[PDB]
Structure 1
Amino acid sequence: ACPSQCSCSGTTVDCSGKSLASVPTGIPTTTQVLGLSSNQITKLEPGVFDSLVNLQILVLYQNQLTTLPAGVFDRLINLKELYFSNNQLTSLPAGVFDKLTQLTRLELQTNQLKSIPRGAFDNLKSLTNIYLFNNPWDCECSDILYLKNWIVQHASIVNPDGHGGVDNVKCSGTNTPVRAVTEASTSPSKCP
């Protein structure tokens, strides 16, 4: 059955724009597309998505999330697209994307991210487009070096489709490109 606060169309569950603070309980396990955008979600509980083994698209755009619980996406082995822009994310858990081998699209723009955990994208061997602009990347901290190395390596897939490319991943304050950060200019002690 469709959750009372959402609208359902086939295997798509549209819970967007309903002033929700919580993900509904009892989303059908056959769901392939889950829209949660434009709500009031500030915190996801551990395991909130574990049932959604058939999910291919997850939309969390325009909420107020600041962190994620460890393992939150681990059961989403069929995910192809993750739309997580326009939240307030300040960090990502280690390993958070490790199970998303089919992911082609990852949207992280317009958050509060300072760095990406080392190796976070290691298993994303289908990824064709990632968005990272409009985050206050902390280029004084040595934690930035993985992101720098990864965007330099994979420059063609960063911020495509008119979003400024690899150069639009910018250091907070100085506004210089993250891709130009040198190891010697960073410090492990200048890390919040």
Structure 2
Amino acid sequence: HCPAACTCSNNIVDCRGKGLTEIPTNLPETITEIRLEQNTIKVIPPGAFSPYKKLRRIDLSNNQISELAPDAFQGLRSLNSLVLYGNKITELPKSLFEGLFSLQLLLLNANKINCLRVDAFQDLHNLNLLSLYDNKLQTIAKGTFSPLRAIQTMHLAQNPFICDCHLKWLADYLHTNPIETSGARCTSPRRLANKRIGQIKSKKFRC
């Protein structure tokens, strides 16, 4: 029930840096933490973690993940952290984070994410730390942050933000809630390129 390359004890499955090419299957149903970071997993298959509804922490960071089934984390109502940084993720399928009502940490930094659905974080009521650092986001649609009622910290930088009239809400949001702490900058238009989104008056975000 414990993969031969990993060490499992105290409900933790630890397969950190053991050459894994896929998520191991038939683990104990009681598992509360799964450590799969620093392997070469490429695919998160349909309802991958759905058998383990007692999961509180998943670490999938520093793999080669380019594909996530939309029900990869379905039913994980007790999940507190989802750590996905350092993969090749390009889009978040609809409902990927559906029903993760206990999630507190979501790390999506160092991926290739080029857009976010306005409902991407619809169920993340209790999230405290989100990172989208070092992705390919040009914009975030007004409303994407509305469901984040417990948010305390965001890492948004190293994204090519176009600071036009469609990102103006984010200027206002951050003036009100100065919780962006990685020094997010505009990259376009040229008039605002390389300036911190928090240092720019909203009135300057125009189309």
TM-score (norm 1): 0.83
Match of 1:143 among 166, 181, 196: 166
Using the TM superposition, name which of 116-125 and 5-14 deviates more.
Answer: 5-14
How much identity, in percent, do the aligned residues show? 28
Runs of 4+ in 1 over 6 A off after TM superposition: 3-6
Match of 2:185 among 153, 157, 170: 170
Larger radius of gyration: 2
Match of 1:42 among 66, 79, 85: 66
Q: 1:93-104 maps to which residues of 2 (within 5 A)?
A: 93-104=117-128
Q: CA offset at residue 23 of structure 1?
A: 2.3
Per-residue CA deviations over 1:58-78 (Å, capped at 9, x if unaligned) read: 000100111111111112111
| Matching residue's letter, 2:107 | Y
Matches of 2:35 and 2:42 in 1, distance apart?
15
Using the TM superposition, name which of 91-100 and 7-16 deviates more.
Answer: 7-16
| Matching residue's letter, 2:118 | A
Answer 1 or 2: which has greater strand percent.
2
Contact 1:16 1:37 in 2 (8 A): yes
Matches of 2:120 and 2:91 in 1, distance apart?
11
Q: 1:8-157 maps to which residues of 2 (within 5 A)?
A: 8=8, 9=12, 11-23=32-44, 25-26=48-49, 27-139=51-163, 141-155=164-178, 157=179
Matches of 2:137 and 2:149 in 1, distance apart?
23
